[PDB]
């Protein structure tokens, strides 16, 4: 009859996300990188120099988090920032090196994330998530 | 093809979960209440007295997020803290009557949120994704 939160799609997205992030933490050597940091670095590797809303657009991460992430990555010298109200952001060579070094592990993470799902299941979930985030 | 972070299943989960939380925030009347807060409250409604790990188990929300939720809900007097009758040392959280009312008040909206989140998925697609997400989250 009533509400069961555990069987609701919204909750089941959180678990699946959360599970993905935990897998990412186990799999990435020595908490070198958070998942958000990795995503921002990838966006920069693929796209090139970006504004802040470029990075938000690219990564689907809220602006306040991205600002934080860029600051931490600036500190670690993995990216560069430059002006005069608007800023650019660009990979440093260590930046790109770290990304390249982690991309073999990120592949691992994907398989793990898909879990028990069989190949038809894998296609189906990706189809459904695409169809969900789009519309 | 090479690795693009955006095509991969981790990102689509991220995007779809962002969409859900935006939907949650837009439609929930009580603007102080977070998706995590709400879920914890539903778990106490369904389970009665719970330890911190009970809530982590019931919800699969991480322990840091849970303590934070509990602390926030303690402040608004929506849950009470007691001692475990088994262990005078170990602590229990329990809905207050106010907590129970608010859960009941939000149920319609939660249901709407679910509907919005499914968006334009057809009745079979709604079943398929709930199933695949559970299968994914097990093992």
Numbering used by the authors:
A (entry chain B): 13 to 95, 100 to 151
B (entry chain A): 13 to 151
The authors write:
BpsR is a member of the MarR family of bacterial transcriptional regulators. MarR proteins often repress genes involved in the response to organic compounds, environmental stresses, and virulence factors. They are obligate homodimers and many are responsive to ligand binding. BpsR repression is relieved by binding of 6-hydroxynicotinic acid (6HNA), allowing tight regulation of the pathway to control NA metabolism according to the needs and environment of the bacterium.
The secondary structure of the protein is primarily α-helical composed of 6 α-helices and 2 β-strands per monomer. In the dimer, the two wHtH motifs are positioned in tandem to one another to create a DNA binding surface. The model suggests that helix α4, from the HTH domain, inserts into DNA major groove and likely functions in DNA sequence recognition. The β hairpin wing motif extents away from the protein, along the DNA helix, to provide interactions with the phosphodiester backbone and the minor groove. Although the DNA sequence for BpsR binding is likely different, residues Thr76, Arg79, Gln83, Arg84, Lys86 within helix α4 extend towards the DNA bases within the major groove, providing potential sequence specific interactions. Within the wing region, Arg100, Arg101, and Lys102 interact with the DNA phosphate groups in the minor groove also contributing to the stability of the recognition helix interactions within the major groove.
